[PDB]
Design a protein around this nucleic acid. Structure first.
Ligand SMILES: [Mg+2]
Ligand SMILES: [Mg+2]
Length: 342
DNA sequence: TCTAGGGTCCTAGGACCC
DNA sequence: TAGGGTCCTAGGACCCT
C-alpha cells in the first residue's frame, strides 16, 4: 500500500507575480525586500538576480553589493494571496486531499485519484500546465511515496519542471541525500550532525535509533525515520491558523519609551484589522509583545487575555522595555495574539 | 552585508492537581 | 506520600516568500 504524494511549489513566487503584472521587470534583476535604509532582507528574487547570488533571507545590503543594479520591490500581498487562492482552487479540481504549507505550495494526496489514469506524474503535469494557462505563472512539482521526499523532489527540476521518485528508486536516492535537504533539518542541526560525521541519510542509516534518541530526543527518531524514507505523516486538509502577529523593524533603533509607544499605536490598528477578519468579536486566548534589541537578542512576553486590548499591550511593552532593555537600542517592536483553540 | 515578517512546532522548569 | 499527571510561559530552530 504505497501512497502517491505530490508537492506543488510556485517558481520564484513573489517575483514571478511582479514580472507577470509588469513585464518591464522580466529580464532585469529584481527582488521583493525592504530597502537597505529600511534595514531589509530579500523575500525572494528572480533568476536574473539569483545569478549574482541574491537569495531569500539575504540582508538587502548584501544583495545590493552582489548585484548593484538590483531593483527592489515592496511586495503586493493581496496579489500573492489571489494567486494562492487560485492555485488551491486548481488543486481542488483533482483532489480534496490538499495540505497548503504556505501561500505558494501544497501537498496533494492523489493515491485514490482516478484522474489521468491514476498517474500522479500526469496529474502533476496537468496541474502545472493549468496553473500556467490560468495564472501565467509557472510551478514545479515533486512526486514521491511520502511527504518529505515529494517536497525534496519539487526542488530538483525547478523552474517549470518536475521530478518523480518511485519506491524502487528511494534507497539509491536516500544514500547520498544530504541531511540538510530534509525539511526541519536546518543550519544548526546540520552543523551538529556534520560534527559527529553525519552528512547524508546513508550516514544516519549506519546509526542506532537508541543513540539518536539520547542525542536528539524526538528529533532523533525523525532523523532515523527520514533517513530510511519513512514518513507516515498523512496529508491533512483541516489545519487552522493558531496565532496572528504584527511587527516592524525600524530604519533606526529607538532609544526612548515615547518612540516605542508611538510604534505600538501604529501596529495596533493593523493587528485589530487582521484579527477581526477571522474573529470579528476580537476574542482570543492570549496577547503579548515582542522586542528585538540592537544586538539581536529578542524577548516575548505574552499572557492569557480574553479580548484584544491596546492598553494592555502598551502596558506589557512598558514592563518589557523597563525590565529587559538594559539601555540597548530597540530595532523591532511587535504585537501578538494566540487564537482560541477550536 | 548586517541581518524581515508571516507563521509552526518542540522543549523545559515551575505551578498546580491528585 | 513520593511521584504521577497537565497548563503556563519564554525561547529558539525552522519553515515560506
Ligand atoms: Mg516556491
Ligand atoms: Mg514554497
Amino acid at each position: 500500500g504505497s501512497r502517491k504524494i505530490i508537492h506543488v511549489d510556485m517558481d520564484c513566487f513573489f517575483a514571478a507575480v511582479e514580472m507577470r503584472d509588469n513585464p518591464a521587470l522580466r529580464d532585469i534583476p529584481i527582488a521583493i525586500g525592504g530597502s537597505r535604509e529600511r534595514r531589509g532582507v530579500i523575500s525572494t528574487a528572480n533568476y536574473p538576480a539569483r545569478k549574482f547570488g541574491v537569495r531569500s533571507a539575504m540582508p538587502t545590503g548584501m544583495a545590493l553589493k552582489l548585484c548593484p543594479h538590483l531593483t527592489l520591490l515592496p511586495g503586493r500581498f493581496d496579489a500573492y494571496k489571489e494567486a494562492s487562492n487560485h492555485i488551491r482552487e486548481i488543486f481542488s479540481r483533482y483532489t480534496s486531499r490538499i495540505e497548503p504549507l504556505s501561500l505558494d505550495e501544497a501537498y496533494l494526496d492523489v493515491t485514490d485519484s482516478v484522474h489521468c489514469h491514476g498517474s500522479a506524474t500526469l496529474i502533476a503535469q496537468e496541474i502545472r500546465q493549468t496553473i500556467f494557462n490560468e495564472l501565467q505563472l509557472t510551478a514545479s512539482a515533486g512526486v514521491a511515496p511520502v511527504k518529505f521526499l515529494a517536497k525534496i523532489a519539487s526542488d530538483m527540476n525547478k523552474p517549470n519542471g518536475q521530478f518523480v521518485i518511485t519506491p524502487a528508486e528511494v534507497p539509491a536516492f536516500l544514500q547520498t541525500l544530504p541531511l540538510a535537504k530534509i525539511p526541519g533539518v536546518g543550519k544548526v542541526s546540520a552543523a551538529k550532525l556534520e560534527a559527529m560525521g553525519l552528512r547524508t541519510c546513508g550516514d544516519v542509516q549506519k546509526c542506532d535509533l537508541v543513540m539518536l534518541l539520547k542525542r536528539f530526543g524526538k528529533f532523533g527518531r525523525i532523523l532515523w525515520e527520514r533517513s530510511q524514507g519513512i514518513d507516515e505523516r498523512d496529508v491533512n486538509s483541516e489545519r487552522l491558523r493558531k496565532s496572528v502577529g504584527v511587527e516592524r523593524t525600524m530604519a533606526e533603533d529607538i532609544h526612548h519609551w515615547s518612540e516605542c509607544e508611538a510604534i505600538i499605536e501604529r501596529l495596533y490598528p493593523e493587528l485589530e484589522r487582521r484579527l477581526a477578519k477571522v474573529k470579528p468579536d476580537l476574542l482570543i486566548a492570549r496577547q503579548g509583545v515582542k522586542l528585538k534589541f540592537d544586538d539581536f537578542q529578542q524577548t516575548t512576553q505574552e499572557h492569557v487575555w480574553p479580548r484584544l486590548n491596546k492598553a494592555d499591550l502598551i502596558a506589557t511593552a512598558r514592563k518589557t522595555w523597563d525590565e529587559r532593555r538594559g539601555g540597548r537600542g530597540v530595532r523591532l517592536v511587535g504585537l501578538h495574539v494566540t487564537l482560541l483553540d477550536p
